[model samples]
Target: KKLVVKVHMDDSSTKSLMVDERQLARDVLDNLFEKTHCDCNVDWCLYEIYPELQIERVFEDHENVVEVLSDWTRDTENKVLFLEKEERYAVFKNPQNFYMNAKNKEYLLEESFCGTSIIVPELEGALYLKEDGKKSWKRRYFLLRASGIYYVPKGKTKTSRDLACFIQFENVNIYYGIQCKMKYKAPTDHCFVLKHPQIQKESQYIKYLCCDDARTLSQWVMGIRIAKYGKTLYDNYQRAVARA
Candidate 1:
């Protein structure tokens, strides 16, 4: 007999999969993994949720679905099965893939500061000194977003009309007021560099940037941190929207 199973995926959203009750638990998990695009390297297990008593039972890999749910008396439509990670796996090892997915776009805000603040906290009209490979420093108008940092020529009024460069956050390290003397003419204070490895296990590739003041510098750093962690919520929101 075919049974409609409500599977709560790893991302905390539920999906209904019409499964054969005669199938082994491993086959159901394999189907769920394929549908969810979950990383196959991580060890995963399934759990049957009992909302009334606030308990759950983990399913064994060899168990048949019919035998596993034989005593399930609650509403079959409301039967919840959760797919959970067995342990801390390498989810962030290849960081680029996390941000490249288009569905992750969302507005991020910080609530604890003076008031509700946004990811663009110190972004608009923010002035920064950017140094290129030619040892040249140029003053630019900066804008920060969850995607990356963008800059326009100093006098540019319309952001859309100006030249822009982006420094992405994936696998990139952000350092505040770090040393910049040996590589560039700019002084160390009020400067920050985004460093990352161009190739795996290689030395970091660096980009130097300078803020006008300490507050601006701190706000920009906070913005980057927010973007990094805030992406998880945005990803979950996208999944919910897709499921709906």
Candidate 2:
């Protein structure tokens, strides 16, 4: 069976794609690129917006389009947009910006993109975690690991022994908190969220992390991608280039 997904382009034009439920966002974009007669640039990827929640983020390549659409309510203003975002592959290009490292660095595997192994630096830092069932936010030291995100409890060092699990990327996708100043009362304008793929409407389970600056926000977003997807991101980049 096929479902019609309305993907809006940057020029206010939209394409209603009748896509298979099993198709990924990458497939939808490829079809869109051909239909729209647009160049297949990796930056030209899909994004979604939650109007009510004021949230937005890229539709990752591995995401299933139908399941993602089914997550939204029947009567919702949520949208799937087709926008150009340089950061989608920019992180893979310059891992140094997103990854914290020493002066002597190689960033990823091989600079030529042939190497399959991707070595991303540690993306651990202090971020404000919003309290659940409450509005207050608390500063916590967080670490990004392949298993899950860990946080250093108060008075504990950022080590494996003392680190507490915050949330895992197993079934969650990240989003940027649009207009979070008014919505989340965030300390800074830079806010990101992690929510389950099954979650459509706003729920208390949504994990919010507010950063002090935009650079930090970019760092975390890309860092988490590396933590979750690992070498597959380079594969995404490689395939995106092939499609281009």
Candidate 3:
């Protein structure tokens, strides 16, 4: 039997194709790429979400397409999968000694800090920051470092030395939106906040920051965690990526 199915591309687009139910998963993928003009060099896969079960499964190339789709509902849409490219770090391939011995000493000047090894002195981006007693929220450019979080005032360009406000993370706790009690204009769906200890030993104060999207929020949170933990935490990651 022949059937029509939707194929989702990695670029957040969808395509409908006529496919033979009896064809192997590999044949279906070939047709999917040929008709969709997907990148042949890049690897891809097929997957469907089971919302009811809160799980998903990837299709094996040897499996029958029709048999796999048999478990799917006709009325709802199923997502196609593409394998993500592996992330690699360049520093691990050759140690610092490799550069020290190089004939062209200019490469040494270009030496950079490894994400896992050193502290990122500054991380800057636009996010909403909560105000103290005014119960107001405003969007501002923020620069983050191990010492504190700084803001660039409106109509002003950000510089490492000049900041409108600074909030120290030392002796403080970082909390996701779900755990925060602060009020902000941005919804809690994509927000994170910092809790600072009070000098009087009375109570802790909170400052809320909003992310544009869930993915960005996740990245910012991970960045903060890594920054707090330092490069030693990523030694295993560096070694693992080097092996790959």
Candidate 4:
């Protein structure tokens, strides 16, 4: 029972191929590894989309999730963090304050407004915070996608390769392609198939944080590999279920 999933980039028109659960999980690790390897600061923002995967600004409750946009800088002495105005930036160690800077001190408050960035120490196991009983703002489900099929709308140029692009603050790079594969596979705009159980689990966990509904979907064409992106393979169990 291989569960083929299609991931669609809301910003771009690129779609990924139908992937099983194992491949999907690998995609997640690949994105994380890329960002970690670069030692780049990530700026994460929330998105909202309906069934078709048309996304927009996060709506409804704001406090459920710690919605702040921030960034990290690489310097010899220590890492510098940037946050939006009126926001407080804190890096958690034992005391949760290895570095606490007023948003103003880090960056012009305006610069950080779009989203919040937090430094995830690679040394200590990354914190998957679950607050208010359920998973908290710190815990997240990520999707890493490689171009599979391109769906350029009528009257668009081949040079119009990228369909969409998004960033989780700054560290995470989300890209979409509209014309990667020769097939016209933008049949659906969402990612992942309906039968995915992780989609439900993730959606349930994320809902409490007040981010977008995790039980969403996206679509990509077919025949893409995680290897091109330098991503590792997923666990064997995931293969059994997604393909089941």
CA lDDT of each candidate? 0.51, 0.79, 0.52, 0.24
Off by over 4 Å in 1: 1-122, 126-130, 152-165, 181-183, 197-205, 231-244
TM-score of each: 0.38, 0.88, 0.41, 0.20
Winning candidate number (lDDT): 2
Q: Give per-candidate clash totals.
A: 0, 0, 1, 39
RMSD of each: 18.4, 3.3, 14.9, 23.0
- Per-residue C-alpha lDDT of model 1 across residues 1-244, encoded as one tens digit per residue: 7777777765768888777877866667778777777665434556655443222334544547765565565553225565553321112222222223423222112131213332323344444465445656766666676667776655665556674657777666454434444545554356765655221121325566777676565556556654544544333323323432
TM-score of model number 1: 0.38
Best-to-worst ranking by lDDT: 2, 3, 1, 4
After superposition, candidate 2 runs with Cα above 4 Å error: 100-107, 111-118, 155-157
* Predicted candidate 3 versus true structure: per-residue lDDT over 115-173, tens digit per residue: 33455434578777666645466777777665667677666766656666567655543
User: What lDDT does model 3 reach?
Assistant: 0.52
lDDT of 2: 0.79
**Full-model lDDT, candidate 4:** 0.24
RMSD to native, candidate 2: 3.3
Better of 1 and 2 by lDDT: 2
Say which prediction, candidate 1 or candidate 4, comes out ahead on TM-score. Answer: 1
Prediction 2 TM-score vs. true: 0.88
Which ranges of candidate 4 are over 4 A from the true structure? 24-244
